[PDB]
Amino acid sequence: DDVRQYVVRKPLNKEGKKPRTKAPKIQRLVTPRVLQHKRRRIALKKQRTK
RNA sequence: UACCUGGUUGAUCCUGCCAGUAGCAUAUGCUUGUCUCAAAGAUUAAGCCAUGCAUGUCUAAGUACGCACGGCCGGUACAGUG
Questions:
Q1: Nucleotide nearest to A15 (CA to C1')
Q2: Residue A9: in which H helix or E strand, if any?
Q3: Out of the domains of life, which is the source?
Q4: A28-40 burial by CB neighbour count: b if 16+ within 10 A, else e?
Q5: Which residue's C-alpha is at the least distance from the C1' of B63?
Q6: How far is the CA of A13 from the C1' of B23 (A)?
Q7: In terms of DSSP H, where are the helices of chain A?
Q8: CA–C1' distance A13–B59 (Å)?
Q9: By the 8 A CB rule, do A26 and A4 touch?
C-alpha cells in the first residue's frame, strides 16, 4: 500500500483567508534519498577495504 | 651629587641621641586657567544588603499538522519564513 495517500488532513479554515488543507511530514518513510544514503555508506565500506 | 647642619660648656674636644634635610605613599587643609595619560570601598566590616542587569544558543544539514503569516495549484507525503 502507498502510505502517502492515507494521511489525515487538517481542514484549515479561518475567516478572510483562502481555503486551506494541511498535512504532516511523514517520518521513517523510505524515500529515494534514504536508499541513497544507505548505499553511500556501503560505498565507504568498500573504499576502506580496498 | 659617595654631602651634612642646630642643640649639653664660662670656654674646649668628644661620646651620644633629639631636631632639622630629601624622596615615596595614604589622608587632609588652602588654591586652581589650558591640554595628554591615568589610580580609584584594599586597610576598619570575607559586615549587612532594597531594585535593575550580569548566560545563553539554529544552520542547506536532529524534531514543524501553531493559517502566526503568506503561498503554490489546488488529489498533489512535507512549498517556504517560522
A1: B67
A2: none
A3: Eukaryota
A4: eeeeeeeeeeeee
A5: A27
A6: 90
A7: 32-49
A8: 33
A9: yes
- Protein CA A10 to sugar C1' B20 (Å): 103
Q: Please report the resolution in angstroms.
A: 3.0
3-class SS of residue A45: helix
Experimental approach? cryo-EM
Under DSSP, is residue A6 helix (H, G, I), strand (E, B) or coil? coil
Distance CA A31, CA A50 (A): 29
- Show which positions of strand B are touched by protein (CB under 7 A): 63-71, 74-79
* Total length of chain A: 50
A36 alpha carbon, distance to own chain's centre: 14
Residue position matching grid coordinates 502507498 = A2
